């Protein structure tokens, strides 16, 4: 005590009917706020700061619920203060919580569970405490730098006038690469020179210097370290792959070059990123990671890269324009794992409110990562503007005219002005892309003549506009901003139709890419219409995992398209996620560097050779294996790798994981054993290479993701069979292989939820505990539900982004598959029928648990032993041996 029974104040952003915010803190158990949405939180003011000392919390029924409560004495920091999670009914004595004499002027109550509904409610909430007689500070107003006032922009523009200091920045920072990629210890071994461009192309030389450094030029930056790294891979047998395993163990002396090379490259641009991937991926990445990452790009010949960081700060400062408030603004804008969809215009709000300190930290870091860009020569492609405004815009701007989009996925899609209206209609996309463009100059400054956008993306509607009309609009729109722009267009699935394609009346200032060009290419449409266009790599999908790559049609079809066309200018790679297949990313960017097709196989013996820092007959012999079983040549149409059994929502006859995605193993699954028994064999020789180590657990989770599609398939005929001992013994080896399987995950760093997780709750600095919790839920529902049911279920997105990762095995694959196992051994057993699982309800009790107050999922792998856990599987668990098991 004592009760806090005047001057409280509370809002929501979203209600069902009738059932409003107020209705939360009426004094009346009858009366109850109702969420209708995501926000499924109240935010309640208490007229000055208290120190609480109680909270009281009343339900509409006596379901199931579980929440959190957090408390602010500064108005910016919302801190967590109380929570439930056991599983107690409510009733009508409510739930009384303890807390620590906390001052508060603000509580924030997330109910991120109910039993009964999808819909969450609180009847009443009384609150207790002490009036400490103060009263909440102003909340500061979100403002940020113009890139003008920086120091950004001083040394944008000094690069830019003055070439002995660019040169000599460029030359510093292949120098700062060499010692962040190799150690600090090997930057003096080097000398880095600026040449010209060999006929029009990219260039590099490596050669000796006469002293026993190597001498590297190159025409710019990401030259010069595409011949550092040709270097390593051919000289030193060293391989760079901050993602996916490295080899960066130099030898003792630095190797002679002999005879000096030069190395062109036929391409203008070697793109990467899919918007996909700064979700997927990208998501939680400090400085550091784009660092390395860019790094990474530049060594591997990389000069175009999709860029959207901090494009929440423009999208601001352009709606604030237009009649928005920075909370509507917010309230628009995706959370952090959700920018892909956001900015493809499938999406809005979903996994926000973002800090109010996510703008300026944002704007930051992509002023940062343009300083880099401009040192190496790379082009971030930035964004254009098409049309893509709030449902609401109407109404804030009531002579604007909009085509409503539809849904996307249970996802209300944003709206989209009409490119163009009638006379005596105000045109609001010329006035909204005029101050979209302006803002955009105004937050990173001229950095790029290359901008994206693409408007229906998988779907929409362009209401009564031509298809054509719009395209040209748009484009003629975005070179009046820049009369260097050329629009970065994305072809998926025969969209921009040719109708749309033909509307671009300057072919040259367009550039298209051809998404899935390795698995289902469409550039000839492109090609025949004189567009420009990028031959890319798509490879992987979701970030789903497995053994699974291209790499014959990668060593010929791109040499092919070349000889065969007028309009290609570039390769590039666009996964939606870059985490799986190291070989088929090393391979696709070498293809940049020659104009004949090459031998896949004696390529791949060549790159083991290096990726290990060894090899042998009996690990070659593996690797053609998998040449000749997993990343065997295929001309069918799919999407990602082979998904895992484990990974799939239980059922019977399961084809897939996702919705889109396929099962179905192509090869020979006792062959593609045999690759594990050689790894296994050689282990010990082996083990001190970590790429090594990351190739044997790849391989060998792909054995028992293979050998547990076997085992399902035999528990599900002893359950249609009615064999209730048979099930139980098949049923009972299928869960303790998944076991198996979540010890070879716990080897990698990079397979452990926990790093996902925790790079999440700690990617800006000086979050509140709301911030952390926010953000968890982000990296927790994209791997699973993605979105909330309407999304999982009805849009087909449920489990689209299923890793094959530790501790999300073992708390959520596992615990599907044991559940339902249990459902059919009781009905087995002379026990009622199965009933049926909810899934999703599962599914999302574990998307919004906390790593504070739950379970924290570990950031450090374990020291299990990958080839004896290839022994037991090969023992126990496998498809060679499945007879002898049973
Ligand atoms: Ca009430």
């Given at each position: 005590?004592?009760?806090?029974?005047?001057?409280?104040?509370?809002?929501?952003?979203?209600?069902?009917?009738?059932?409003?915010?107020?209705?939360?803190?009426?004094?009346?158990?009858?009366?109850?706020?109702?969420?209708?949405?995501?926000?499924?939180?109240?935010?309640?003011?208490?007229?000055?700061?208290?120190?609480?000392?109680?909270?009281?919390?009343?339900?509409?029924?006596?379901?199931?619920?579980?929440?959190?409560?957090?408390?602010?004495?500064?108005?910016?920091?919302?801190?967590?203060?109380?929570?439930?999670?056991?599983?107690?009914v409510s009733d009508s004595n409510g739930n009384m919580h303890t807390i620590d004499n906390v001052r508060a002027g603000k509580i924030r109550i997330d109910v991120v569970q109910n039993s009964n509904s999808d819909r969450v409610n609180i009847a009443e909430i009384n609150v207790f405490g002490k009036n400490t007689g103060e009263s909440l500070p102003e909340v500061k107003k979100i403002a940020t730098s113009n890139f003008s006032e920086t120091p950004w922009a001083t040394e944008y523009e000094k690069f830019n006038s003055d070439s002995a200091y660019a040169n000599e920045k460029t030359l510093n920072e292949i120098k700062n690469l060499v010692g962040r990629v190799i150690g600090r210890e090997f930057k003096d071994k080097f000398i880095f020179e600026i040449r010209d461009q060999l006929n029009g192309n990219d260039v590099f030389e490596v050669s000796d210097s006469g002293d026993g450094k190597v001498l590297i030029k190159g025409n710019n930056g990401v030259s010069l370290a595409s011949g550092f790294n040709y270097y390593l891979k051919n000289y030193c047998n060293v391989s760079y792959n901050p993602i996916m395993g490295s080899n960066l163990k130099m030898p003792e002396t630095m190797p002679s070059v002999g005879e000096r090379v030069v190395i062109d490259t036929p391409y203008e641009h070697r793109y990467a990123l899919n918007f996909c991937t700064y979700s997927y991926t990208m998501s939680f990445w400090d400085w550091d990671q784009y660092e390395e990452f860019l790094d990474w790009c530049a060594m591997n010949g990389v000069n175009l890269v999709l860029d959207i960081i901090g494009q929440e700060e423009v999208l601001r400062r352009t709606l604030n324009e237009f009649g928005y408030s920075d909370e509507e603004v917010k309230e628009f804008i995706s959370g952090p794992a959700y920018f892909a969809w956001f900015y493809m215009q499938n999406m809005t709000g979903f996994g926000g409110p973002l800090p109010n300190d996510w703008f300026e930290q944002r704007a930051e870091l992509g002023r940062k990562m343009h300083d880099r860009m401009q040192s190496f020569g790379i082009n971030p492609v930035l964004q254009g503007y098409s049309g893509m405004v709030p449902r609401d815009f109407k109404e804030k701007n009531q002579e604007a005219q909009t085509i409503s989009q539809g849904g996307w996925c249970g996802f209300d899609r944003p709206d989209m002005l009409k490119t163009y209206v009638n006379e005596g209609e105000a045109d609001y996309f010329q006035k909204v892309a005029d101050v979209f463009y302006e803002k955009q100059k105004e937050v990173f400054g001229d950095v790029t003549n290359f901008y994206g956008v693409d408007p229906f993306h998988e779907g929409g509607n362009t209401g009564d506009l031509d298809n054509g009309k719009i395209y040209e609009i748009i484009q003629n729109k975005m070179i009046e901003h820049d009369n260097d722009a050329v629009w970065v267009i994305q072809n998926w699935q025969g969209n921009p139709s040719n109708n749309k394609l033909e509307g671009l009346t300057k072919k040259d200032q367009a550039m298209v890419l051809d998404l899935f060009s390795e698995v289902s290419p469409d550039w000839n449409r492109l090609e025949e219409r004189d567009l420009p266009w990028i031959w890319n790599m798509l490879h992987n999908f979701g970030g789903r995992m497995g053994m699974d790559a291209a790499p014959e049609k990668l060593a010929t079809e791109i040499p092919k398209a070349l000889a065969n066309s007028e309009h290609m200018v570039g390769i590039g790679i666009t996964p939606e996620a870059i985490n799986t297949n190291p070989l088929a990313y090393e391979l696709l960017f070498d293809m940049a560097w020659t104009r004949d097709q090459i031998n896949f196989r004696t390529w791949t013996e060549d790159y083991i050779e290096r990726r290990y820092g060894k090899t042998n007959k009996e690990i070659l012999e593996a690797w053609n294996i998998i040449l000749d079983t997993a990343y065997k040549k295929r001309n069918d149409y799919y999407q990602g790798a082979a998904e895992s059994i484990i990974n799939a929502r239980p059922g019977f006859g399961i084809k897939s994981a996702s919705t889109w995605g396929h099962s179905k193993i192509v090869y020979d699954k006792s062959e593609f054993e045999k690759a594990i028994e050689i790894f296994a064999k050689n282990y010990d020789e082996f083990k001190d290479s970590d790429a090594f180590l990351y190739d044997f657990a790849d391989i060998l989770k792909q054995l028992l993701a293979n050998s547990a599609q076997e085992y399902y398939?035999?528990?599900?005929?002893?359950?249609?069979?009615?064999?209730?001992?048979?099930?139980?013994?098949?049923?009972?080896?299928?869960?303790?292989?998944?076991?198996?399987?979540?010890?070879?995950?716990?080897?990698?760093?990079?397979?452990?939820?926990?790093?996902?997780?925790?790079?999440?709750?700690?990617?800006?600095?000086?979050?509140?505990?709301?911030?952390?919790?926010?953000?968890?839920?982000?990296?927790?529902?994209?791997?699973?539900?993605?979105?909330?049911?309407?999304?999982?279920?009805?849009?087909?997105?449920?489990?689209?982004?299923?890793?094959?990762?530790?501790?999300?095995?073992?708390?959520?694959?596992?615990?599907?598959?044991?559940?339902?196992?249990?459902?059919?051994?009781?009905?087995?057993?002379?026990?009622?029928?199965?009933?049926?699982?909810?899934?999703?309800?599962?599914?999302?009790?574990?998307?919004?648990?906390?790593?504070?107050?739950?379970?924290?999922?570990?950031?450090?792998?374990?020291?299990?032993?990958?080839?004896?856990?290839?022994?037991?599987?090969?023992?126990?668990?496998?498809?060679?041996?499945?007879?002898?098991?049973?």
């Open positions: 005590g004592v009760e806090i029974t005047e001057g409280v104040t509370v809002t929501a952003k979203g209600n069902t009917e009738g059932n409003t915010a107020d209705l939360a803190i009426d004094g009346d158990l009858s009366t109850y706020w109702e969420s209708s949405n995501d926000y499924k939180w109240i935010e309640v003011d208490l007229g000055g700061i208290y120190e609480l000392s109680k909270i009281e919390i009343f339900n509409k029924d006596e379901a199931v619920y579980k929440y959190n409560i957090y408390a602010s004495e500064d108005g910016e920091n919302f801190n967590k203060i109380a929570y439930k999670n056991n599983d107690n398939e035999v528990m599900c005929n002893a359950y249609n069979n009615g064999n209730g001992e048979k099930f139980k013994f098949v049923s009972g080896k299928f869960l303790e292989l998944i076991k198996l399987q979540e010890r070879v995950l716990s080897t990698r760093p990079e397979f452990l939820i926990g790093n996902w997780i925790e790079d999440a709750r700690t990617m800006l600095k000086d979050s509140d505990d709301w911030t952390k919790d926010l953000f968890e839920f982000n990296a927790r529902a994209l791997v699973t539900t993605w979105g909330s049911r309407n999304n999982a279920d009805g849009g087909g997105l449920k489990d689209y982004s299923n890793r094959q990762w530790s501790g999300l095995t073992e708390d959520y694959y596992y615990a599907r598959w044991e559940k339902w196992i249990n459902g059919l051994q009781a009905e087995l057993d002379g026990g009622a029928k199965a009933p049926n699982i909810d899934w999703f309800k599962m599914e999302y009790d574990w998307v919004n648990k906390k790593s504070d107050t739950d379970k924290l999922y570990p950031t450090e792998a374990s020291n299990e032993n990958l080839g004896e856990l290839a022994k037991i599987a090969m023992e126990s668990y496998s498809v060679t041996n499945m007879d002898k098991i049973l």
